[PDB]
């Protein structure tokens, strides 16, 4: 009988594929392209969750809020934390949402720091080995290869942006999801709205970023695969700074497209963001 695994988003699901391979039955709740903060699970997701031998969720205020979907899911399914479902973010230095609006809440976009993605993967393989010790061999060899593949990319991101002047190191995305990236890789970031729970693209939010750009003008703006592009397109039209590239934050790309995995989305993000900020 195959181990039944449920991941909450395509990032976590892809991390689990990289470790488990063909040895598990994997279900991803939030489909590719959809927002993982406010996605509403479907009956098939409730069913596969209740029959899951292990569930992996992000935690740190992505889906585990008080009135959030995952908390309702595991409560209604009567699952126990650290026995059935596990937060793959356990063990990272948390960064909180600065906005006085989101008082005290945590920023969930930890995977944008590659070292946290390694922590995510280590937490995934830890529980896969504990519940399916038959395949401890394969989980460890895939984790070891995955961690190394991510470490090389991490060492690359540490010096990817050294050629760009400090007055032009600004990653501008629609959502303020780059906090862990900025801390880890020395590139400040700006946004329209801080988290997808807020209203996305108000005239004040747009006009504030317009003024922010006048002070620190980057060569390029960016837009996420999982957000409506019209807010960032208004900022781009008004500021005159073109959006250099689509980037990947809260979701991987569809099967077949560039960035259709966590590693590929990070290499894509490093490639495109370094390219755009140059000119």
């Amino acid at each position, epitope marked *: 009988d195959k181990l039944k695994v449920v991941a909450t988003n395509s990032i976590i699901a892809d991390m689990t594929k990289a470790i488990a391979g063909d040895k598990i039955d994997l279900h991803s709740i939030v*489909p*590719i*392209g*959809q*927002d993982p903060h*406010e*996605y*509403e*699970p*479907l*009956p*098939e997701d*409730v*069913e596969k969750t*209740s029959n899951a031998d292990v569930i992996f969720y992000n935690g740190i205020n992505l889906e585990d809020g008080g009135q959030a979907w995952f908390t*309702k899911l595991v409560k*209604n*399914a009567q699952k126990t934390k650290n026995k059935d479902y596990f937060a793959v973010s356990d063990g990272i230095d948390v960064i909180y949402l600065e906005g006085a609006s989101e008082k005290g809440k945590e920023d969930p976009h930890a995977w944008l720091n590659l070292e946290n993605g390694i922590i995510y993967s280590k937490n995934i393989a830890k529980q896969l080995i504990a519940k399916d010790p038959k395949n401890k061999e394969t989980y460890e060899k895939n984790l070891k290869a995955y961690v190394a593949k991510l470490e090389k990319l991490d060492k690359e991101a540490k010096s990817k942006f050294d050629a760009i002047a400090e007055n032009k190191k600004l990653i501008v995305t629609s959502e303020g999801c780059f906090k862990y990236f900025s801390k880890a890789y020395g590139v400040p970031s700006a946004y329209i709205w801080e988290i997808n729970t807020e209203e996305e693209g108000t005239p004040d939010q747009i006009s504030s970023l317009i003024e922010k750009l006048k002070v620190i003008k980057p060569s390029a703006l960016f837009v996420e695969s999982s957000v*409506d592009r019209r807010p960032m397109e208004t900022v781009s039209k008004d500021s005159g700074i073109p959006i250099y590239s689509e980037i990947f934050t809260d979701s991987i790309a569809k099967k077949g497209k560039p960035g259709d995995s966590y590693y590929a989305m990070m290499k894509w993000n490093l490639d495109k963001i370094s390219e755009g900020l140059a000119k």
Partner: single-chain antibody, 215 residues
């Protein structure tokens, strides 16, 4: 904040027709949308849903005669060949729990879950609307809806025990697996409505029970 259906009209059998659910005050790109019909006098019947990502699921009787598509602002229901038995009011409802519904558009064509009772009645006390399902649902995907006549359904309880915003604890939902129960205490004059029930199943199929009118 609002859903508005359009396109319904009176047609002959075999006439194709397309209905449109237009959203006002929010975007559809991040909500599941269901199409539900209700024949005159008869009860609520689920047709299908379009998942926010784009997947489509339909009832087993659709036979491919009803097709759902979505844009950033509208959801389409393309009926390819209408029969007189398709005479109904066609609603769109948002979300997996069908939180809020449109007013409905009327289509006239011209020339499973069983609630044990059809009716129940008290003055100011307590009534029970019960539910038997053929198969288990996820064990908790059951929802209760109140439908005052000539109005869209209002959702009362989602997930079988969880109240919706602004519904009193007076409405109590219980049950698990196949048997579910809606209990209404402190009965009021405007509790008079036909209380329906909707379950979600494996394969993302939804089904309403028959009515349970209340006095």
């Amino acid at each position: 904040q609002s859903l508005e259906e359009s396109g319904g009209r009176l047609v002959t059998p075999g006439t194709p027709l397309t209905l449109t659910c237009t959203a006002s005050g929010f975007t559809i790109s991040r909500h599941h949308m269901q199409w539900v019909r209700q024949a005159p006098g008869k009860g609520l019947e689920w047709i299908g849903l379009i998942d926010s990502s784009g997947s489509t699921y339909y009832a087993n009787w659709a036979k491919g005669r009803f097709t759902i598509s979505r844009t950033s602002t509208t959801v389409d229901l393309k009926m390819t060949s209408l029969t007189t038995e398709d005479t109904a009011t066609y609603f769109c409802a948002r979300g997996g729990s069908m939180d809020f519904w449109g007013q409905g558009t009327l289509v006239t064509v011209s020339s499973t879950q069983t609630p044990s009772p059809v009716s129940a009645a008290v003055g100011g006390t307590v009534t029970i609307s019960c539910q038997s399902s053929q198969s288990v649902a996820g064990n908790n995907f059951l929802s209760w809806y109140q439908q005052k006549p000539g109005q869209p359904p209002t959702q009362l309880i989602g997930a079988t025990s969880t109240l919706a915003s602004g519904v009193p604890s007076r409405f109590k939902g219980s049950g698990s697996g196949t048997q579910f129960t809606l209990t209404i205490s402190d009965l009021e004059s405007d509790d008079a409505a036909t209380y329906y029930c909707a379950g979600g199943y494996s394969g993302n199929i939804f089904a309403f029970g028959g009515g349970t009118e209340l006095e």
